[PDB]
Amino acid sequence: DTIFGKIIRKEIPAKIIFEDDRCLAFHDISPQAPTHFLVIPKKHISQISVAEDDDESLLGHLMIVGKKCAADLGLNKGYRMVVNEGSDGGQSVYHVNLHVLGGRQMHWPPG
Amino acid sequence: DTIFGKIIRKEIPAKIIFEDDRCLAFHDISPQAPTHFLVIPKKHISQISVAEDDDESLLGHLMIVGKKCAADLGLNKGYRMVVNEGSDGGQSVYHVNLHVLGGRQMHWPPG
Ligand SMILES: Nc1ncnc2c1ncn2[C@@H]1O[C@H](COP(=O)(O)NCCc2c[nH]c3ccccc23)[C@@H](O)[C@@H]1O
Ligand SMILES: Nc1ncnc2c1ncn2[C@@H]1O[C@H](COP(=O)(O)NCCc2c[nH]c3ccccc23)[C@@H](O)[C@@H]1O
């Protein structure tokens, strides 16, 4: 399975900042901002392009959890949420993952 | 209200590529990729940091609609989804909006 599959199954260790029945959040190993963490579903969805209609609430939950974690981490000046799909998106771990980045001005274009 | 509020109320014209009872999608006026469109809720939420828990399904719907529009627009090599919060996120229109960008390699960091 993927790296994130291994984190979910508790095969690879990770320092978590949030967990519930539906998702996990943890800091990125290669941070691109002073604050950079990930929110991932526990359900295996390899990429957002294959998410099903009934995954709507789960995907929204990732963003609500991202919002809450951002607040807890003191990102009061703002942040950026990112989901990458496939090669052009730069996906590297093929498990749906929401990036939340902040603590610096985020620029444009977003990559 | 905001620019997007005006688009929703059909005060400002916009060429739409998707509409339902909950959201609208349309191409960005200042595209940053060969394909760059936006998905916005019809409900007024000024920024993701003030989204409520019960907005989970709506937020997920934006991503599912983004996914579907991306497929329709032929983004088979991938894409990137982005939501900006506040000043550090680069928010400029204070109405929740999901960017979908593709048709080129998206780079890292994402801004
Ligand atoms: N054990 C662990 N704990 C915590 N974080 C972990 C981790 N193992 C891995 N990560 C992280 O997962 C993230 C996977 O995100 P992604 O959206 O699949 N690819 C985005 C990065 C990227 C790569 N190549 C690109 C090319 C062009 C654009 C972008 C890129 C990475 O930020 C980082 O590797
Ligand atoms: N009528 C119309 N039809 C179609 N698209 C329209 C439009 N009117 C406006 N837009 C678009 O809304 C988007 C608003 O996105 P945002 O996430 O609020 N800001 C991101 C851009 C940005 C700005 N400054 C920054 C600084 C640092 C990082 C980023 C930035 C813009 O891409 C573009 O202006």
From Swiss-Prot, chains A, B:
<feature type="binding site">
    <location>
        <begin position="28"/>
        <end position="29"/>
    </location>
    <ligand>
        <name>AMP</name>
    </ligand>
</feature>
<keyword id="KW-0053">Apoptosis</keyword>
<dbReference type="GO" id="GO:0005654">
    <property type="term" value="C:nucleoplasm"/>
</dbReference>
<keyword id="KW-0597">Phosphoprotein</keyword>
<feature type="modified residue" description="N6-acetyllysine">
    <location>
        <position position="6"/>
    </location>
</feature>
<dbReference type="GO" id="GO:0016926">
    <property type="term" value="P:protein desumoylation"/>
</dbReference>
<feature type="binding site">
    <location>
        <begin position="90"/>
        <end position="92"/>
    </location>
    <ligand>
        <name>AMP</name>
    </ligand>
</feature>
<keyword id="KW-0007">Acetylation</keyword>
<feature type="modified residue" description="Phosphoserine">
    <location>
        <position position="30"/>
    </location>
</feature>
<dbReference type="GO" id="GO:0050850">
    <property type="term" value="P:positive regulation of calcium-mediated signaling"/>
</dbReference>
<dbReference type="GO" id="GO:0005856">
    <property type="term" value="C:cytoskeleton"/>
</dbReference>
<feature type="modified residue" description="Phosphoserine">
    <location>
        <position position="57"/>
    </location>
</feature>
<feature type="short sequence motif" description="Histidine triad motif">
    <location>
        <begin position="95"/>
        <end position="99"/>
    </location>
</feature>
<dbReference type="InterPro" id="IPR019808">
    <property type="entry name" value="Histidine_triad_CS"/>
</dbReference>
<feature type="domain" description="HIT">
    <location>
        <begin position="3"/>
        <end position="111"/>
    </location>
</feature>
<comment type="function">
    <text>Exhibits adenosine 5'-monophosphoramidase activity, hydrolyzing purine nucleotide phosphoramidates with a single phosphate group such as adenosine 5'monophosphoramidate (AMP-NH2) to yield AMP and NH2. Hydrolyzes adenosine 5'monophosphomorpholidate (AMP-morpholidate) and guanosine 5'monophosphomorpholidate (GMP-morpholidate). Hydrolyzes lysyl-AMP (AMP-N-epsilon-(N-alpha-acetyl lysine methyl ester)) generated by lysine tRNA ligase, as well as Met-AMP, His-AMP and Asp-AMP, lysyl-GMP (GMP-N-epsilon-(N-alpha-acetyl lysine methyl ester)) and AMP-N-alanine methyl ester.</text>
</comment>
<keyword id="KW-0804">Transcription</keyword>
<dbReference type="GO" id="GO:0005829">
    <property type="term" value="C:cytosol"/>
</dbReference>
<dbReference type="GO" id="GO:0005634">
    <property type="term" value="C:nucleus"/>
</dbReference>
<keyword id="KW-0963">Cytoplasm</keyword>
<keyword id="KW-0622">Neuropathy</keyword>
<dbReference type="GO" id="GO:0000118">
    <property type="term" value="C:histone deacetylase complex"/>
</dbReference>
<dbReference type="GO" id="GO:0006355">
    <property type="term" value="P:regulation of DNA-templated transcription"/>
</dbReference>
<dbReference type="Pfam" id="PF01230">
    <property type="entry name" value="HIT"/>
</dbReference>
<keyword id="KW-0788">Thiol protease</keyword>
<keyword id="KW-0547">Nucleotide-binding</keyword>
<dbReference type="GO" id="GO:0043530">
    <property type="term" value="F:adenosine 5'-monophosphoramidase activity"/>
</dbReference>
<dbReference type="GO" id="GO:0016929">
    <property type="term" value="F:deSUMOylase activity"/>
</dbReference>
<keyword id="KW-0805">Transcription regulation</keyword>
<dbReference type="GO" id="GO:0016787">
    <property type="term" value="F:hydrolase activity"/>
</dbReference>
<keyword id="KW-0225">Disease variant</keyword>
<feature type="binding site">
    <location>
        <begin position="97"/>
        <end position="99"/>
    </location>
    <ligand>
        <name>AMP</name>
    </ligand>
</feature>
<dbReference type="GO" id="GO:0006508">
    <property type="term" value="P:proteolysis"/>
</dbReference>
<dbReference type="GO" id="GO:0070062">
    <property type="term" value="C:extracellular exosome"/>
</dbReference>
<feature type="modified residue" description="N6-acetyllysine">
    <location>
        <position position="15"/>
    </location>
</feature>
<comment type="similarity">
    <text>Belongs to the HINT family.</text>
</comment>
<dbReference type="GO" id="GO:0072332">
    <property type="term" value="P:intrinsic apoptotic signaling pathway by p53 class mediator"/>
</dbReference>
<dbReference type="GO" id="GO:0005080">
    <property type="term" value="F:protein kinase C binding"/>
</dbReference>
<dbReference type="InterPro" id="IPR036265">
    <property type="entry name" value="HIT-like_sf"/>
</dbReference>
<keyword id="KW-0539">Nucleus</keyword>
<keyword id="KW-0378">Hydrolase</keyword>
<comment type="subunit">
    <text>Homodimer. Interacts with CDK7. Interacts with RUVBL1 and RUVBL2 and is associated with the LEF1/TCF1-CTNNB1 complex and with a KAT5 histone acetyltransferase complex. Identified in a complex with MITF and CTNNB1. Interacts with CDC34 and RBX1, and is part of a SCF (SKP2-CUL1-F-box protein) E3 ubiquitin-protein ligase complex. Interacts with SUMO1, SUMO2 and RGS17. Interacts with the Ten-1 ICD form of TENM1. Interacts with CALM1; interaction increases in the presence of calcium ions.</text>
</comment>
